[PDB]
Every structure is written in C-alpha cells, then in structure tokens.
Design a binder for these strands. Structure first.
Ligand SMILES: Nc1ncnc2c1ncn2[C@@H]1O[C@H](COP(=O)(O)OP(=O)(O)OP(=O)(O)O)C[C@H]1O
Ligand code: SF4
Ligand SMILES: [Zn+2]
Ligand SMILES: [Zn+2]
Ligand SMILES: [Zn+2]
Lengths: 512, 495, 97, 39, 158, 86
RNA sequence: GCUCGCUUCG
DNA sequence: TCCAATTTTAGTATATGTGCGTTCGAAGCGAGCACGGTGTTTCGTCCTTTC
DNA sequence: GAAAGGACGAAACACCGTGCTCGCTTCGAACGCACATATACTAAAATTGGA
C-alpha cells in the first residue's frame, strides 16, 4: 500500500500541514502504537505529537483504544484518509438532493469533523446571512428542519458518545473514556428550543453539549452506488427502467443494510403505488418491465419469489461486478484500442481459451493478437493457467490458457488510480511551487487594489496596476490557472473509478 | 569572498546497513543504459561500443584507455555501474526462497498478511522491544510463518488461500483450487466448469483438468507485492527502510564496472580474454532482444514462455552459476564463474582476499643453522636487505645517519633507494642524479626508504602455522650469505 | 601477485592472521593486511551510504555529504560485487571521536 | 567483532586497541573567558 | 475451407480491409434499424423486436450490397456479427423459433441489435498517466519525473 | 535474429492513444470550484497546524504590530484521553 | 595477463 | 438424554532427497584460449585456342 | 616457345543459431551430516446415532 501511503501523505500535507502529516504517515505505516513510541520514532516534541493526534482524532481519522496495563494505542484509518478526497462529491450530492442549507451543513461537518447541532446551525446561519442581503436574517428553524431531514435519511450520524462516568465505574478516571456507539440515539436529534439570527460579519449553557455529529460516509457511498446502477440501467435499456430501479432502490434503502448479497424483495403492487405519478404507466407495463429486466443476461434484478403478484429482488453484488467489468473493459479499450478490448471481452466471456481459439473467435490476423495478449500479460490484466501434463512443468509439454481474474485486475487498477491521483497532486504542487514568485507578485499588485477599497480610494491607483511587468506574465498566470483547473478536474473524475473499484473489492470480501 | 568548506574529516565507519534497491534506485545509481549485445566495433581498432557492454563510461579495465565518466587512469578510477532493462521480470534466485516465504505469509487476493488483529498486535508488541537480535528476528519470522500457514481462509477479504510451493525450477504454484474430498465449494466447481470452450476446442484439456492450480509467474508476484500494505511489511520481518517487497523481483540488472570485469587484450591473436560475467550479461541482453523480436513478430505462447524461462535461468546463473534444479536440456555446457562462486570457496574474496591476502615488503628463503647468533636475532642476506626497504622519517636525531645513507646510494649495502619529499610526494630514485646534493637538501619530515640494517625488528615465520609461536619478531643482522640464519634453539617453535 | 616468476609477494594466510590476533598486535595486523597490501581511499556519501567518485555522489547528485575513507581495495571490490547482487551495503559514517 | 575490523581495515577492539591513549600536553581545561561588555 | 481457401483469405493473404468494410456496413445497418425502431415508438416490446435483426436478414442485406465477388455464407455473416459483439457495439439474443425464413439452428434463432455502450470513456484515460507506456518507471526524483514529463507537457499545450 | 540498437529507447515513448477529454457540465465545474475553495479555506483553518517558526533574530517594538493573531479551537478533553492536554 | 591440470618442495 | 462409534484434525514422529563442507602455503611447466558451418565475395591460376 | 579472355575453384569474411554430423543418454555417487518436507498415520476430541 505504498501508493495509498503516498496519497494519504499528500492529502494530509495539503489539508492539515507538515508536523501532522508526518504523524499520520507514521500511524498508517506502523499501525497502532502508544504515544511515547510515536514521539520517539517521529523525532519531534511531545506537544506537537499531542496536537497532531488531537487534530487527527477530531476529524475521525485516527482512533484510540485501551489495552493491558491501561495503555492507550492510536491507530489510523487509511480508508478514512482516502475518503477525505471525496468531500467535493459529497458536497455536490448533498446540494443536489437538498437545498444549499444542507450543503453548508455537510461542508461544515466535513471541515470540522465533530460538532454539535447548535454549533453547526449557528455556523450555517452565519454563512447564509452573507448569501442574502437587504436586512433579511437567517432563522434557526429552517436550518434545524433541514438538519433533522438529513438526519432521518441517515446522511448525518451522531458521533460515538462517552458513557456516563458516574453510573459506569464511579471512582478513578481511566486514561481513556472508552467511547462507545449506541444505535438507539444514532439519528435522534436533540430538542433545542433556542433560536437566533446570524450576524452579517460586522465585527463591531449549551443544551446539546456532548452530542457530536458527523457525516455518514456509508450513506453517501450507498447513494453513489444507487446512482451508478441507475445510470448503467438507463444507458442499457431505457430511462423508464432507470426510474423503476431508482424507486426500488429508494424503497430498499431503509429496509436493508450497506452490505448484503441480496436486498429485501419487493412486490409489483408496492412498486406501482410507490412510483411517482408523473409517469403514465399501468400495472401490466410495470410487470413487463420487471419480467424483461429479470431476463437480462446482466442479472440486475431477480424474481426470487412469486407471492404477491410480481415479487422481485435487486442484485447488488452482481450489478457491482458488472460495473467493475465495464470499467475494466473501458480502460483496456482506451489504453490499447478497440481490438484489444475485443480480445479482452473474448477471453473474459470464455473462462479459458488459447491463442488459436482467440484468433478463430475474434477474427484478428496473426502476429497482432498475440502481441496484444502479451502486452496485457505484461500489465497484469490476466493470468495464465498453465495446466501441466507432468509435474516437471516444462514449457514444451504443457498447455497455456488465458484467463482474466476480475479481483486481481480490479486491485491493480485501484492501485494504478491511487498512484495516478498521487502523481496529479504532485504535478499540481510542483506547478504551484515553481510559479510562487509570480503568484506573490500578482497577490501584491492585486492587494494594492484590495487595500483602501473605499476609504481614501483615489482613482490614480487604477491605471498603474497593469503598468508593471506583470501584464506579459498574465499569460503564464492564465496557463497555470487552466492547468491547475484541469488537474483538479481529472483528480476529481478519477475518484469515481476509485469508488467503483473500492466498492467492488469491499463487497466481494467476507471478513470472516 | 571565500566560503568555508571542510577539506577532510577523520570519518570512521560505524556499521553497515544491508538492504535492497528498487528498479528506480537502480536507474538513479547507474550512469548509462546498456542495450548493445556486442563488445567491440567492426573497425580494426576494436574500440568498445557506445551504450553497450565494456563501455568506458562504466570505468576502465585497460592501462591506456581512461574512463569516460571521470577523467582518471585505471589506478584512480573507482568504477561506475550500469543498468539493463528486462522485457519480462525474473525471480531473484537469492531471494527466491524469501519470495516463497512472503507468498506463504500474505494472502494471494487482498495482499494482506494471514494474521488476526490480536496476533498482529501481539507480534508488533513483541517486535517493538529494543535490542532485537538476528536470531530473535529469524525465530519470530519462523513463528509468524507457522501461524500463517496454520490458517487457510482470509479474515480480510474472505478468499481461500491454499498451499504455495515450488514446482520445477524458479516456478511457484499456489493450490487455490484444491481437490476437496467432502462437499465441493462453489468456487472450485465454477473454476472447473469455466473450461467449457477450452474442452470444446481442445479435448485434451478435459483429462488434464485436474492439477490445474494457479501459477505465480513473476508478473503476478510483482503485481501482488506492489499492493502489499506498508503496515504488514514489518510483520514480514523485513526492514521498511532497507527495502520493499516489490524489490525481491528484479526488473533491472546492475552491470558492474570494468574493475570487476578485467579484459585482457591478447594481441597475439584476433581475440580478447573476458570474464564469465561479461558473457552472461551479453547472453541476457541477447535474450531480451530475442524476446522483444518474438513479441513484435507475434510468436506462439509456448516459445515465449520458453524464452522467459531461459532468461530467468540465465539471470540465475549470472547470480549463482551452481544450481540443482536445472533441466538436462537446459543445463550449461561449460562451467562459468558467478558472483556466488567468486564470493565463496577457498579462493573467494573473504578467504582469499579479505581474511588472508598477499603483501609486499616480504621475502622467502631457505634456512640454515647458525649458533653464533642470539635467540632474538636472525641473519638476513645482503641481497634481500637491499630490496626490502624501510621508510624512515627525517628528524633531528637521525639526520646525519640518513645523510650518509643517501650518500652511499642503492649500491652500497648501508643506504637507501628512494627519497620522498615532505612538500611534494614525488619520489626520487637515488640511482640517478647527484646523491650528494639530495643529501645536503634533506629537510625534516622527508621519507627515506633505507635498506634493512642491523637492529630493525623483522617478522620471521614458517608458513605452516600450528600455534602463535610459529611467527616471531627478531632483530635483523645482515650477513654476506644467501640464507636466513637463526639460533637453532628457536627451531622447536618453528618446527 | 603469486609466483616468483610473476615476482609476487608472500601471503599472510588465515592462520598467520590467527597468530597475529592471538598475540594481540592490532596495529601490526592493520599495517600488514590493510596499509601494506591493498590500501585505498574511497569516497562515501553520508546521506545514502553509497560509494562516490572524486568527491561526488551520482546517486544524490550532491557533494556536501561525500567524505574520504581509508579501506582495503578487496573490501571495496566486495561492496561493488554485493551492489551488483542487489545486496546493497549502506555505510553510515561517523567521526572517529 | 574482530573479523569485520580486519575486513574494513580498522584496528580491532581486542589486543592493544581495547583502550585509548591521551597526550600529557601542557594545557588548562576551561580557560578564562573574555567578558562581554555589551551583554 | 479450414486447411485452405476461405471467404476472407485471398491467395494466402488475410483481407483486413474486407472484414473492416463488412463490420462497418453491418454496424451501419444495425444502427439504422435501431434508429427506426426507436423512432417508431409504437410499443417497447415491438421496438425491441424491430431493432432485432436476424442473421439471415443481414446476410441477405450484405448479399444485396455486393461489396466483394466471393459468395458469403450465412455463418460468415454470423462470425462477422460475433466479432462486432466482441467489439462492444452490438448485442445478440437467442430466441425460440421452430421454423421460418432462416431455418439455420433447430428451434433457435439469433437476433442482433445495435446497442450503445454502457458508460462513456472513464476519467483515467483522460489523463496522460493512464495511457503512459513507461508508467512503471515513473518516479519523483529521476530521469522520468512528472515535473519534466513530455506527455503532460504536450497534453497541456494542446 | 533481432537487430542491435545503437541508442537506448526514448525516455518517454510515444503512444497513438490519447487520454479521453474530461467530462463537462455545470456539476464538474462546480465541484472543481468547490475543491479550490476548500483548498483556500482549509489552510487558514486552525486545524491546519503550521510549522512553528523559531530562531528570532532580535526583539523589536514592531513585534506587537507584526504579531500573528489567530483564534485557536479548544478540543473537547472529555472524549480525548488525558495524555494530550498541554 | 585469466583459468585449469600435472609435478615437486617442507 | 446419555454412552458408544465414526471422523477429522492436527501434531508428531520416522524417513529420504538437498546442500554444504573437506590445512597452510611455495615453486616450476604444457596447453589452449569460443567457432564453426557453410554461403558468398574475391582473387588467382591454369583447359584450350592463338601468335 | 610466350599470351590472353573467360572459367572454375579455393580461401577468407560473415550472418545465423546456439557449441554434439542425429536429436540420446551415460555412470558414479565421494563422503558425512545437519536442516528439511512429504507422508502417514496415530490417537484423541468431538459430535451424531441407538437405546
Ligand atoms: N602437508 C603439510 N602440511 C603442513 N606441514 C607440512 C606438510 N608437509 C610437510 N610439512 C612440514 O614438514 C615437517 C614434516 O616432517 P616430519 O613428518 O616431522 O618428519 P618426516 O618427514 O617423517 O622425516 P622422517 O621420515 O621421520 O625422516 C613438518 C611440517 O612443518
Ligand atoms: S511520465 Fe508523467 S504522465 Fe507518464 S506515468 Fe510518469 S508521471 Fe504519469
Ligand atoms: Zn570511472
Ligand atoms: Zn485475502
Ligand atoms: Zn548520496
């Protein structure tokens, strides 16, 4: 996981600083370790180690556990540091599904990690008072309504609460309070009757204290998986099937967990009555849609029962496997061409196959199909079976069969995407550092205008800004800006493939 | 004006930290890339080719042609390495056992180590203790390997992990789809039934469907090692700063400088004398070129894998020229000297060049009895005394003696042969030039290579040594005869 | 070299080294096996631990941490051969004090 | 160890190299320091 | 036909242009049929059935085209359509039909339809790092570095 | 037999396949702008701990004018173990 | 000059 | 529900095919050094026909 | 007895494959001794079945 460690290092350096990213990388590479050995191995002062650990545990990046002799050990969550990159996508999806109020709520929750409901509603009101003008004030009522609406949909979840010290072992305080998680009050918001109005940044006791909230990334991952499945089935059959499967997944969201081979089955009557009335679709049309989706060779849905009219179920693991297969065939096509993608799909459909059979089934002339096969072998896109006639395993007396393993190829592609995003971040930081001189020059020449904006603002300071030598350098500035924009766009768009591969790898494990 | 930089520091080596180099570090350390399989040019001068083997940018091996990287002669050139890229990765014969061990330690699907969280914490706490020794490290590795081989299913991803063993030579087989006498799992049944097209097009696949386990070629092994989490690296008893699991599989070969590969220009015939390492590297480059040619021309998979196995075998012979599992048809015709053979043996580097090495300022002569000498004195012939010289520094005490010694010259027995000045280190031969002027200009601190005279402490030894008394330091007395003479009473120690 | 026809010198074998060890003469053993036989001065970089040339490290592309060091030439040959065998010896130098 | 001392070309710790020698030079440890007037 | 001759082989020379023209014409015909089926919008089942094209139908269409002089059998067009399926552009379904104008397979008929790809090109291929052939030799400090990369330089310049 | 090569292969070999252009739309641009805003706003956040500057040359009257002032968040010591208190 | 073999020497 | 039999499950304990060693040196010589299999370019020398 | 234009053949670079004309093919260990890895298999623990 060297690429993962490098990506986490880059993210922590760009987001938190230097003295904290070292502690984070040490925790990721060495695992759970007490505080003193961490401070000894890192080589910095104890106070910096404490500050780094506290700022990491605030954003739920690391956790602390008790062990023998009452020692506390800190373990980092590399998965959480990787999910940190998905913050823009989380904000975009919470702005799409909800209003801008929930957008600011999720933004503050991600930027602070753990906060109380009063604090987040106060911050959201203070930030939204700037959006509007003309003396209109922001009340806490609608903000609390949006917060509880996010809560009941499991998008925001209460942080693990420390048990009561008086009731649980009253006496000597333990080194760690041993925070536990309770599912009863996991999504129960507190009753806060206090309201207020946000201030407009003029620059001229807590009822919900102890109750901290955070963003439930599992709900966002489930929503992204549902959106991906809906987009896939829309590209496959039609938008009507996409709406049907969207309604089915919306019904299944509550009654199912985040990891299950099959969801709870639904009947045709409840799917019909739950479908939005905007579609002029009858019962028989829905029955035909369901029975034609069940006959799809992709197995997105399944019958799995006949009671209650049309009883149907949705295959989540099969859909994720199909999405991973589509991603792999797409990257193969874009990296080696359409003919190599044809050979890949041939060797994927046929579990085991040889060179002559590949040439016969793909109709690709010799000296070229073998070349693409060897190129895919050199990139770990497939593995040879190598069935031996004799245990000597001599090449002249054995058969070589080509076979694509989806799991290993998906892991390799995920590692490649991690290293790609790491290289993109490195290139962006290099371009920023090499041009920091022009950046400071432009910042100064623009702060000349930013200073004395209204008070003592003579017009004689507007025709001298572009008089300097910065005007021919504005072209280099624009090139740097567009390069950074494109790098960030690519880094964000690779995160979708990363999410797909990570979901495929997670849902195929048992964790026994 | 002038920046202060230290000229020389009395640096003393504290300890040697062994480790491994990644292919990127191999590229960074090397200066040039060797791609030409030939040695010399087509012209009659037979100059070494550029970017090929025997190139002078990687040091020099001839007294006339200097190095191209550093402008120094053969005596001052320390040598430079090169890097050769391989089309297909090959297992390192030295770390092949380590490769098998690591493959047995970690899972073959998620690359995680076969250890539960409690066992992971226990092993980490056992390893975090200070003063960990080599024996303790090897014992911990053995224990963790046993506890990993005890398990059969993965606690991280849930994939099955069968036995991993060595089949043939430099080939690894993982028994993922093992035969189950009880109710069979769905995975093995799906694997068996996935051969439908293969059986339809080739019936021979059906009888040989059994024993079809996973074959871990260097590509898949390298891909798995590149995805190993850094947290599990200390659990493999391998130092993270020393190396990484991906370094065990070699993709670049470090061709050594010309100092390790001396070349003899035998002008008596139309050929040159080269060591075995140069020929092995030439064969490896030729195999890489042949593999590339077959990949371009679209050859069959059987011959491609045969060329890959031949390249692996040639790399192993370049590393260790004495293997056991070499096939008879793939066995070498002649005998070559690999690095292992150059290291081990009675004539190796450790025993022949490190523990015991030849020195100068020494002689060997037949002995004869002489009872008229003391037991702590030994007679040295005049002829040997004129050759074995001692460097005496000119001081305020022996100035008038060294003056007369220089005046006598290298012909008279009491005298010297060379004078090294204090300011300049240019030696001066006393056989030429006015010796009187040199004697009159003997400054304090000069070195005079005086002849062996009476009173000099000299080691005297018999080469067959049983105890320490076989070699003793005596006082040299010069005699006109030609034998080493000493008191016979000291005959019993020397035997 | 080895032979008299090749004008070679005598060889202090392993047992001679054992006798010199038993006597405890460390300076004489050092002068015989290092100074008088295969003495050389190499350049080692204190950052990466590799061998440099002419006070320059090609690996790190710097020369501030390169320092001279006395060594038997056979030891340098062994280090180079080990580097060829992917067994990289990293030398951590320090002051003699 | 002795073998590594012989290989690396450094004096071995056993024998005469177990101890260190000091020079009985005319000196004065902790010499008088020039006083600082401005501080 | 296996040891010598064949509709594709001409004087021991594989005709790549011929199979390319066949693939292009078959894909154009299937795409036009799917477009007509979509624009018909009479009924989704009827639309899917009309978008389907039998092997005999496309074989007769190719024979009507007459691109080459060599006679193309039905199984030749079937193999061409299978290669098109392997290209990720069309989809084939085996339906049950006892007898009809095709009569090729006993009780089974293969219907082919042009289908759009599942997803657009991924974000990885839009970056030079994803299509680099020397991606393995990438390193921070060395000859091949992202700072001095030529691929990303030409990509940003373009 | 394969031919001999006089010069090493290029450090960056050319490829006939180019990366697919990035997806366009209001969503991608909004996500890019939001990521840039997060980059700009998270460095000034008190969670972003900077390297403590040291080795001040002299003390001056202008120190109070150039003294960097920034509010510091107070961690909840109830949840955090006792070992991280200053 | 490298290697190997024989041969002697104590 | 409880005592007896079947299985499995790992550990242990006796083999049998591997890899590693086998004194210090010193001095001479005789040999051969990677090549060879033949396909092709070049040069020369000599079967008859000409003075 | 000297000569010449054309012809053959003999010798030395040199491209290709891989030290053996074909595909075969042996013997002997060199001798001890500490690691082992395959098998094998023994016994007991555990759980299903009959009374
Ligand atoms: N192979 C060897 N290893 C070590 N030393 C040897 C060897 N061959 C000879 N020597 C030297 O020669 C000496 C052997 O002589 P030794 O055996 O005591 O008398 P000898 O040869 O039996 O004479 P006699 O036959 O008794 O007249 C001792 C040893 O230093
Ligand atoms: S050369 Fe540049 S673009 Fe290509 S893989 Fe390396 S860093 Fe990425
Ligand atoms: Zn050099
Ligand atoms: Zn696993
Ligand atoms: Zn260095």
């Amino acid at each position: 996981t060297q690429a993962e460690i490098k990506l986490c290092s880059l993210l922590l350096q760009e987001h938190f600083g230097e003295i904290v990213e070292k502690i984070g990388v040490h925790l990721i590479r060495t695992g759970s370790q007490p505080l003193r050995v961490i401070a000894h191995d890192t080589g910095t002062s104890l106070d910096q180690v404490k500050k780094a650990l506290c700022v990491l545990v605030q954003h739920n990046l690391v956790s602390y556990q008790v062990h023998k002799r009452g020692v506390v050990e800190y373990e980092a969550q590399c998965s959480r540091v990787l999910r940190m990159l998905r913050y823009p996508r989380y904000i975009y999806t919470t702005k799409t599904l909800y209003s801008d109020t929930g957008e600011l709520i999720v933004e503050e929750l991600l930027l602070n990690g753990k906060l109380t409901m009063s604090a987040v509603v106060k911050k959201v009101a203070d930030r939204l008072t700037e959006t509007m003008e003309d003396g209109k004030t922001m009340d806490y009522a609608e903000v609390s309504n949006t917060f509880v609406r996010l809560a009941d949909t499991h998008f925001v979840q209460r942080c693990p609460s420390v048990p009561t010290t008086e009731n649980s072992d009253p006496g000597p305080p333990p080194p760690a309070p041993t925070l536990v998680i309770n599912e009863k009050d996991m999504y129960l918001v507190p009753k806060l009757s206090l309201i207020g109005k946000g201030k407009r940044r003029r620059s001229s006791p807590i009822p919900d204290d102890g109750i901290y909230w955070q963003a439930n990334l599992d709900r966002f991952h489930q929503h992204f998986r549902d959106q991906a499945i809906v987009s896939a089935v829309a590209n496959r059959m039609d938008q009507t099937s996409s709406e049907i499967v969207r309604t089915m997944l919306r019904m299944s969201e509550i009654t199912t967990s985040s990891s299950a081979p099959f969801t709870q089955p639904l009947s045709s009557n409840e799917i019909f009555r739950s479908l939005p009335v905007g579609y002029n679709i009858s019962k028989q049309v829905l029955d035909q849609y369901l029975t034609l989706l069940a006959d799809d060779p992709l197995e997105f849905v399944g019958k799995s029962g006949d009671s209650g009219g049309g009883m149907y179920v949705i295959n989540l693991h099969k859909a994720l496997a199909s999405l991973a297969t589509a991603t792999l065939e797409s990257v193969v096509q874009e990296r080696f061409g359409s003919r190599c993608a044809r050979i890949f799909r041939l060797v994927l459909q046929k579990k085991h196959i040889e060179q002559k059979q590949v040439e016969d089934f793909a109709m690709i002339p010799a000296k070229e199909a073998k070349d693409m096969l060897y190129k895919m072998l050199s990139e770990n896109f497939m593995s040879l079976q190598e069935i031996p006639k004799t245990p000597d395993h001599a090449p002249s007396r054995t058969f070589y069969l080509y076979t694509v393993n989806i799991l290993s190829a998906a892991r390799m592609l995920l590692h490649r995407c991690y290293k790609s995003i790491a290289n993109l971040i490195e290139r962006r930081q290099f371009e920023t550092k090499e041009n920091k001189r022009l950046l400071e020059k432009s910042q100064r020449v623009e702060a000349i205008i930013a200073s004395m904006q209204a008070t003592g603002a003579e017009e004689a300071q507007l025709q001298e800004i572009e008089e300097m030598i910065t005007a021919p350098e504005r072209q280099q500035l624009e090139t740097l800006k567009r390069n950074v924009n494109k790098l960030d766009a690519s880094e964000i768009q690779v995160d979708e493939t990363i999410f797909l591969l990570e979901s495929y790898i997670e849902c195929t494990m048992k964790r026994q | 004006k002038e920046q202060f930089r230290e000229t020389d520091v009395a640096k003393k080596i504290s300890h040697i930290c062994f480790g491994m180099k990644s292919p990127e570090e191999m590229r960074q350390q090397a200066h040039i890339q060797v791609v030409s399989k030939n040695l010399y040019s087509q012209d009659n001068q037979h100059a070494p080719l550029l970017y090929g083997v025997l190139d002078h940018r990687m040091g020099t091996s001839e007294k006339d042609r200097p190095c191209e990287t550093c402008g120094k002669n053969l005596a001052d050139c320390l040598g430079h390495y090169g890097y050769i890229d391989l089309e297909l990765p090959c297992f390192h014969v030295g770390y092949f056992r380590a490769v098998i061990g690591i493959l047995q330690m970690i899972c073959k699907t998620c690359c995680h180590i076969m250890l539960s969280q409690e066992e992971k914490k226990q092993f980490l706490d056992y390893l975090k203790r200070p003063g960990l020794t080599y024996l303790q490290k090897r014992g911990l590795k053995k224990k963790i390997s046993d506890k990993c081989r005890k398990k059969n299913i993965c606690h991280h991803c849930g994939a099955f992990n069968g036995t991993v063993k060595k089949c043939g030579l430099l080939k690894i087989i993982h028994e993922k789809y093992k035969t189950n006498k009880k109710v069979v799992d769905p995975i093995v049944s799906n694997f068996l039934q996935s051969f439908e097209t293969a059986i339809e097009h080739n019936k021979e696949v059906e009888p040989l469907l059994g024993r079809a386990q996973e074959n871990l070629n260097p590509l898949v092994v390298l891909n798995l090692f590149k995805r190993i989490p850094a947290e599990d690296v200390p659990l493999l008893l391998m130092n993270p700063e020393a190396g990484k699991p991906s370094d065990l599989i070699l993709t670049r070969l470090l061709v050594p400088p010309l100092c390790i590969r001396p070349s003899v220009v035998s002008d008596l015939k139309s050929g040159t004398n080269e060591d075995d390492l140069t020929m092995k590297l030439t064969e490896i480059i030729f195999l890489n070129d042949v593999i590339k040619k077959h990949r371009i021309s679209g050859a069959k998979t059987q011959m491609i894998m045969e060329d890959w196995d031949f390249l692996q075998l040639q790399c192993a012979l370049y590393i260790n020229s004495e293997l056991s599992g070499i096939p008879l048809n793939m066995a070498p015709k002649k005998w070559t000297r690999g690095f292992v053979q150059r290291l081990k043996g009675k004539q190796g580097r450790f025993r022949g060049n490190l523990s015991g090495k030849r020195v100068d300022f020494s002689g060997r002569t037949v002995i004869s009895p002489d009872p008229n000498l003391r037991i702590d004195e030994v007679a040295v012939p005049v002829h040997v005394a004129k050759i074995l010289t001692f460097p005496e520094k000119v001081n305020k005490a022996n100035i008038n003696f060294l003056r007369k010694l220089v005046q006598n010259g290298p012909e008279v027995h009491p005298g010297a042969n060379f004078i090294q000045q204090r300011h300049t280190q240019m030696k001066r031969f006393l056989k030429y030039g006015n010796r009187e002027k040199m004697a009159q200009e003997l400054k304090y601190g000069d070195i005079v290579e005086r002849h062996l005279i009476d009173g000099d402490v000299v080691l005297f030894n018999r080469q067959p040594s049983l105890h320490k008394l076989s070699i003793m330091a005596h006082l040299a007395r010069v005699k006109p005869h030609r034998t080493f003479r000493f008191n016979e009473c000291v005959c019993t120690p020397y035997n | 070299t080895e032979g008299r026809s090749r004008d070679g010198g005598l060889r202090l074998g392993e047992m001679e080294r054992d006798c010199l060890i038993g006597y405890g003469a460390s300076m004489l053993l050092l002068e015989r096996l290092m100074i008088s036989s295969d003495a050389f001065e190499v350049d080692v970089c204190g950052q990466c631990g590799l061998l440099g040339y002419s006070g320059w490290c090609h690996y790190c592309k710097s020369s501030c941490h390169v320092s001279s060091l006395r060594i038997p030439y056979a030891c340098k040959l062994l280090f180079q051969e080990l580097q060829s065998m992917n067994i990289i010896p990293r030398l951590k130098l320090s002051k003699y004090n | 160890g002795v073998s590594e001392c012989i290989i690396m070309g450094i004096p071995m710790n056993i024998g005469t190299g177990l101890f260190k020698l000091l020079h009985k030079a005319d000196r004065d440890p902790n010499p008088p320091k020039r006083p600082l007037i401005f501080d | 036909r296996s040891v010598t001759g064949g509709a594709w082989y001409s004087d021991q020379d594989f005709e790549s242009e011929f199979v390319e023209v066949l693939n292009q014409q078959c894909f154009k015909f299937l795409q036009s049929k799917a477009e007509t089926a979509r624009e018909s919008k009479q009924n989704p089942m009827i639309q899917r059935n009309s978008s389907f094209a039998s092997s005999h139908e496309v074989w007769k269409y190719i024979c009507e085209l007459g691109i080459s002089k060599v006679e193309l059998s039905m199984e030749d067009i079937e193999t061409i359509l299978n290669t098109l399926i392997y290209d990720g552009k069309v989809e084939m379904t085996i339906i049950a039909a006892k007898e009809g104008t095709v009569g090729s397979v006993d009780g089974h008929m293969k219907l082919y339809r042009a289908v759009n790809p599942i997803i657009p090109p991924t974000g990885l291929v839009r970056a030079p790092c994803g299509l680099c052939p020397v991606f393995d030799d990438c390193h921070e400090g060395g000859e091949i570095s992202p700072s001095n990369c030529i691929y990303m330089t030409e990509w940003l310049e373009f | 037999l394969p031919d001999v090569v006089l010069k090493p292969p290029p450090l960056f070999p050319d490829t006939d396949y180019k990366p697919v252009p990035l997806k366009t739309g209001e969503g991608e641009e909004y996500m890019l702008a939001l990521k840039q805003e997060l980059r700009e706003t998270m460095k000034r956040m008190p969670y972003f701990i900077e390297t403590p500057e040291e080795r001040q040359d002299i003390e001056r009257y202008s120190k109070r004018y150039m003294k960097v002032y920034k509010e510091e968040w107070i961690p909840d010591w109830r949840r955090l173990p006792r070992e991280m208190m200053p």
